Amino acid sequence: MKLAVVTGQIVCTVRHHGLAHDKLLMVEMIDPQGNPDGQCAVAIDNIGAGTGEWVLLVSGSSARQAHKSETSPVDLCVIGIVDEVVSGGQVIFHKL
Amino acid sequence: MKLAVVTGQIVCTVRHHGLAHDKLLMVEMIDPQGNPDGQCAVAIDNIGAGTGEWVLLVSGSSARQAHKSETSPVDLCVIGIVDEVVSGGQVIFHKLE
Amino acid sequence: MKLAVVTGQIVCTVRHHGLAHDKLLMVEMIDPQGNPDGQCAVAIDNIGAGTGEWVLLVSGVDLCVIGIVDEVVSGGQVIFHK
Amino acid sequence: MKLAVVTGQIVCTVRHHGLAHDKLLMVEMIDPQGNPDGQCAVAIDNIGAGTGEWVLLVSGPVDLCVIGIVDEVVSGGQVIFHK
Amino acid sequence: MKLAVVTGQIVCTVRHHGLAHDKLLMVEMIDPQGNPDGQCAVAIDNIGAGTGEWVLLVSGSSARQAHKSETSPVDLCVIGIVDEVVSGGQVIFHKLE
Amino acid sequence: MKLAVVTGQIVCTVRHHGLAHDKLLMVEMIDPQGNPDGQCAVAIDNIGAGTGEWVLLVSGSSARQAHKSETSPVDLCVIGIVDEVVSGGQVIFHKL
Ligand SMILES: [Cl-]
Numbered sequence A, F: 001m002k003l004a005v006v007t008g009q010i011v012c013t014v015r016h017h018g019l020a021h022d023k024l025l026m027v028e029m030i031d032p033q034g035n036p037d038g039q040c041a042v043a044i045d046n047i048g049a050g051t052g053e054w055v056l057l058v059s060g061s062s063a064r065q066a067h068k069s070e071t072s073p074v075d076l077c078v079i080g081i082v083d084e085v086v087s088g089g090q091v092i093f094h095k096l
Numbered sequence B, E: 001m002k003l004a005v006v007t008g009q010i011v012c013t014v015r016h017h018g019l020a021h022d023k024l025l026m027v028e029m030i031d032p033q034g035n036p037d038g039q040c041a042v043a044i045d046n047i048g049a050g051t052g053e054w055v056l057l058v059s060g061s062s063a064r065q066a067h068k069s070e071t072s073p074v075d076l077c078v079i080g081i082v083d084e085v086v087s088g089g090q091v092i093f094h095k096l097e
Numbered sequence C: 001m002k003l004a005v006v007t008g009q010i011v012c013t014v015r016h017h018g019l020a021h022d023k024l025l026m027v028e029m030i031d032p033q034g035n036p037d038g039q040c041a042v043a044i045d046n047i048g049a050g051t052g053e054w055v056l057l058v059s060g061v062d063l064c065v066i067g068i069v070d071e072v073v074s075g076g077q078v079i080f081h082k
Numbered sequence D: 001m002k003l004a005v006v007t008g009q010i011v012c013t014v015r016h017h018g019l020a021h022d023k024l025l026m027v028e029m030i031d032p033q034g035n036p037d038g039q040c041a042v043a044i045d046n047i048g049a050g051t052g053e054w055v056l057l058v059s060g061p062v063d064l065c066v067i068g069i070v071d072e073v074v075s076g077g078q079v080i081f082h083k
Helices: A060-067 B061-067 E061-067 F060-067
Strands: A002-011 A023-030 A036-045 A054-059 A076-081 A084-086 A091-094 B002-011 B023-030 B036-045 B054-059 B076-081 B084-087 B091-094 C002-011 C023-030 C036-045 C054-059 C063-068 C071-073 C078-081 D002-011 D023-030 D036-045 D054-059 D064-069 D072-074 D079-082 E002-011 E023-030 E036-045 E054-059 E076-081 E084-087 E091-094 F002-011 F023-030 F036-045 F054-059 F076-081 F084-086 F091-094
Touching: A002 A036, A023 A054, A023 A076, A023 B084, A036 A054, A036 B002, A054 A060, A060 A076, A060 B061, B002 B036, B023 B054, B023 B076, B036 B054, B036 B061, B036 D002, B054 B061, B061 B076, C002 C036, C002 E036, C023 C054, C036 C054, D002 D036, D023 D054, D036 D054, E002 E036, E002 F036, E023 E054, E023 E076, E036 E054, E036 E061, E054 E061, E061 E076, E061 F060, E084 F023, F002 F036, F023 F054, F023 F076, F036 F054, F054 F060, F060 F076
Parallel strands: A036 A076, B036 B076, C036 C063, D036 D064, E036 E076, F036 F076
Antiparallel strands: A002 A023, A002 A054, A002 B084, A023 A036, A054 A076, A084 A091, A084 C002, B002 B023, B002 B054, B002 D072, B023 B036, B054 B076, B084 B091, C002 C023, C002 C054, C023 C036, C054 C063, C071 C078, C071 E002, D002 D023, D002 D054, D002 F084, D023 D036, D054 D064, D072 D079, E002 E023, E002 E054, E023 E036, E054 E076, E084 E091, E084 F002, F002 F023, F002 F054, F023 F036, F054 F076, F084 F091
16 A cells, blocks of 8 residues: 555546446655655546546456446556645645 | 556566556656656556556555455556646646647 | 664654544664664554654554564673663 | 567477467567567467467466567557568 | 575564464564675564574565465565575574584 | 576475475586576476486476475476487487
């Protein structure tokens, strides 16, 4: 499980039917401190995260489960939006 | 998933039955700034992507599910053709140039 | 498995229902000598570890707390105690 | 999946009976530009590829398995391999 | 599998139920020449290894199977205590040395 | 799947009961191509390979299957002994 920032959005009209009508968001991995890994990816989204918001990503077979079921053709899925990250009385990230 | 550009194709007349008669695309990955990275591979495709087009790729067991089932001998599968990619408040790719 | 110190907490009220009734921790890994080793990470936590506590982590999403560490002894010497 | 050239054969008469009726190949991976890329490997083969032939390899009974023999490869407009 | 030296131990009174009451050893891996390499870890143990002793370690899903089943939350498990290691026609470790 | 050379033997009297009475061999992975390298490991063996002989190793869940079943507590198993390796028709390794 990893933290990531939603950097944007991808649009595929012709797509695999098992993606339903869920958003495909451009996500860029970060350290929990907030350090871009350069690592880019596209994550399916059914929670409803917007760009700039920090998200919690699950990959692999859990990414399938998290999206819907084992049938899902996904290897990367957003399972949470971050409200804040604290570090002993200090809020290093907060959602606005 | 990952973004790649269909750079070409592979033709295997003699092939594993679980590949069906689906297409075998040469794909090169794409980076945040919208550019072809170093990384390359071959991905199966029944959606019908063509060379030059950008595609969304799934890998590992998910690719097997995507293509057919765990019977499928694939580690990479195309799950969509990309119409446009908007990142950082800027359109970094669009079909219609 | 790996040792780590809980450096903080990640809050997610809006969350996947499968992840429900779990805590999300910010953790920093501990090197062979009992020192925090820079590389920070995110771990799932259903035991209930607070910041400052040491935790045992299994790698298999990925990081999960599988215990809170009362003490650690190395080559004869205690390198950590609650 | 990955492209590779069959560089040779590994012979094992004494073998696990589950592995029976398969061929063991020595393969070298092929980079984006159609050149052998140094990193050699071992692949299982139940199709039947000889040395010199190019093969398609899936990564996933152990790791590398030949899932086809390559008749030709075209990249950015240009044919980089033909049988 | 891998050879390691039990260098110490970890005590977790509050712990996941699927760890049972098994021991939690600090293990450092060993290299071909018979020496403690850099790599270290914590491994579960119901065989009963003691500090100083060399042990055979299994990792990943195999470790879960080794310890109990896929219910076990472990990525490392001891599967034996090493009496001796003979390599290159030379005894490179023995209990009684 | 990887090539390896059996460099020696390990002896564990007190051992996991799911190892039966099978040999535990010191194995050193073979570089590309012809000689060994740093990578060391211990592989379970039920084929019966001796020291110096080149072996075919399977790891992970297949290593479990190859040894006996999913029950097996092994992450590395020898599934073949090499008779020979031929490059471009040039026997680079042959068994004595
Ligand atoms: Cl392997």
